[PDB]
Design a protein around this ligand. Structure first.
Ligand SMILES: Nc1ncnc2c1ncn2[C@@H]1O[C@H](COP(=O)(O)O)[C@@H](O)[C@H]1O
Ligand SMILES: Nc1ncnc2c1ncn2[C@@H]1O[C@H](COP(=O)(O)O)[C@@H](O)[C@H]1O
Ligand SMILES: [Cl-]
Ligand SMILES: [Cl-]
Ligand SMILES: [Cl-]
Ligand SMILES: [Mg+2]
Ligand SMILES: [Mg+2]
Ligand SMILES: [Mg+2]
Lengths: 358, 356
């Protein structure tokens, strides 16, 4: 048990498509800020917590599956839900949290600290801290601006350094002091533009599916990534105005290196895509989705690649990522976007470990 | 038990927000077409079947609760899901049906005939047949054109009479023979344009919520139905091209009367709205929504109507219905729209009784 010799904390990422428990060991520097954060336990379950029947047996059984076989129980627990919960009104969210609190009260060891729906802006903050912790970029003052994107099921986040800015909402900015350095960041989350939610607007778009993919309306896929992308852009910009909100700011605060986490790490890492050095460009991403999924015959492709439950979405997802990043945020199609490998289990929960101590 | 003396079948509408079991008794006419269709049992459960965990304990307990206390047994069952299921790929849908087929196989008191996801066009056909059955307009050749809309959680349907084209997808045309007469219909379903799916695009729009309603991003409602309606219209037309697809067809094949079923019956029936004769106009709906919800203070309104689980959405909903029927379908904002009262339990399931 590492927790006999180190501080330990459990943090649950209750995301829109599933929940992930992490138990971290850590030490602390002279200011009691965590260092040496190591993941000592990970368990993931599907589907998302906000998706399940809000009754007591359903909620208790889910929590049981997530938590009951954890090797270490007598530690602080944070259960933080993101955009899956944000789709529900507060009265309906309360049902899940009242049951969750009771479940925890009936367990011996666990110290529930907080169980709540975090704002998209806090999610963004935790996204940035988690990625910069992993990159080892927090302990000294950086020459260069690191931006972070998190592609979730129901929201997406974008977060990048920006000096305190009176022209921008207080709610879209965060100042923090960590490892003795002061950092101001712009933060934004877009609810409804996550992959699952976005996809439900385009399931009958033949451009967004491989040739002869059976669309729900009985028609056939006729894939064309540029056309699928255009359709997605209409939701990004004509509907949500992502371009108007993000591009003028990004122009004035250029990012030197972009890191992405969430569904895009899984796509980019799949067997259908070819990228080197865990990094991609949007131009390459759209060209590979177009050639390798959109223009392929669905029954043939599905037989060639049997193991990937997401295969059928890859024409649409490659088009959406481009739509979001290039037409929405205004990122150059030829700009390198780093993604973190899925095996690293990096989500924004490390940000919680660090942020509570500041 | 009328099923000793008359044909009966059970039809389950598995919608995006709930499932409704109907048992119907009926006789058959000269050609074995049903007549004298009567609903003899209704039971509804929430939430939608496609929203629950697709495992044995969960599926089995849902179906047990839906069928428990049914006063009649040992009859054929049709389980037909709509857009909630169409959101899922066939591989995930199969996890639900594999378990549901097995559960039924073990129940000696129910004979499962078919359990499947119907297309939005099938659903639009059944929507039209169900309303026109209730209106008594199928047995004889009709002089007027009757149009039907179904406002669901994940898709919306529109269906109205239309001559053979050749250039229109065969998938959007249906030739129906019933009571010995021939009827040609245009059908269309718009997936993602149902109430729940649409609403997930606008939860941070202040124009769409009563004053001070807490939005998930921490901003406050500031209701303005005309503005909210313009936002929703961008999803209708800029994204979905509803107007380009529907408006030309209605100009070429006019509808004399409109009937709507689904969530709009519930909204129109709310104590906040005032409509007579089970009919509304889009102008009136948008004005009442704007006046009675958008422009009201949320805490006051929530405390005044504590029972109503849909209230927080009524400003959005008023705006969305207008955006859909006027900006989308091209309906005059002063045209009468009949809605079927909710207590009638009318969904498209009557359509399945009539047309297998
Ligand atoms: N192979 C994959 N390709 C694309 N997206 C994926 C893959 N696996 C998981 N995801 C997405 O990753 C996102 C994680 O979001 P969340 O559950 O909201 O934290 C969801 O939208 C998942 O569906
Ligand atoms: N009381 C209500 N007020 C407004 N809409 C409702 C109400 N009850 C049910 N609905 C909607 O009725 C529609 C039924 O669609 P479905 O469940 O897809 O058959 C869904 O959008 C429901 O959310
Ligand atoms: Cl469930
Ligand atoms: Cl469909
Ligand atoms: Cl939000
Ligand atoms: Mg997430
Ligand atoms: Mg329905
Ligand atoms: Mg049986």
């Amino acid at each position: 048990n590492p927790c006999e010799k180190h501080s330990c904390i459990a943090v649950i990422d209750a995301g829109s498509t599933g929940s992930r428990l992490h138990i971290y060991s850590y030490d602390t520097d002279d200011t009691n800020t965590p260092i040496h954060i190591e993941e000592i336990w990970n368990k993931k379950i599907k589907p998302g917590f906000a998706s399940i029947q809000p009754n007591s047996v359903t909620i208790d059984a889910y929590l049981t599956m997530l938590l009951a076989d954890a090797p270490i129980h007598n530690i602080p627990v944070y259960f933080y839900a993101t955009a899956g919960m944000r789709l529900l009104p507060q009265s309906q969210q309360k049902k899940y949290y009242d049951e969750l609190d009771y479940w925890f009260r009936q367990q011996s060891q666990w110290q529930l600290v907080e169980a709540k729906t975090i704002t998209g802006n806090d999610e963004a903050l935790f996204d940035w801290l988690a990625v910069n912790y992993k990159l080892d970029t927090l302990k000294s003052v950086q020459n260069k601006s690191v931006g972070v994107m998190d592609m979730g099921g129901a929201s997406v986040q974008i977060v990048f350094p920006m000096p305190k800015n009176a022209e921008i909402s207080k709610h879209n900015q965060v100042e923090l002091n960590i490892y003795g350095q002061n950092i101001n960041l712009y933060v934004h989350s877009f609810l409804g533009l996550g992959q699952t939610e976005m996809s439900h607007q385009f399931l009958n778009s033949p451009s967004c599916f491989a040739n002869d993919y059976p669309l729900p309306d009985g028609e056939s896929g006729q894939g064309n990534a540029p056309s699928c992308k255009e359709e997605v852009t209409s939701l990004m910009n004509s509907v949500h105005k992502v371009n108007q909100q993000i591009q003028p700011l990004l122009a004035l605060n250029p990012v030197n290196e972009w890191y992405s986490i969430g569904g895009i790490s899984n796509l980019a890492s799949s067997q259908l895509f070819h990228f080197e050095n865990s990094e991609l460009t949007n131009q390459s991403l759209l060209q590979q989705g177009d050639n390798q999924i959109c223009h392929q015959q669905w029954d043939i492709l599905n037989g060639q690649y049997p193991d990937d439950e997401y295969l059928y979405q890859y024409c649409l997802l490659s088009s959406y990522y481009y739509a979001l990043m290039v037409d929405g945020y205004g990122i150059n199609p030829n700009q390198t976007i780093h993604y973190i490998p899925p095996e690293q289990n990096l989500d924004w929960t490390i940000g919680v470990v660090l942020h509570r101590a500041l």
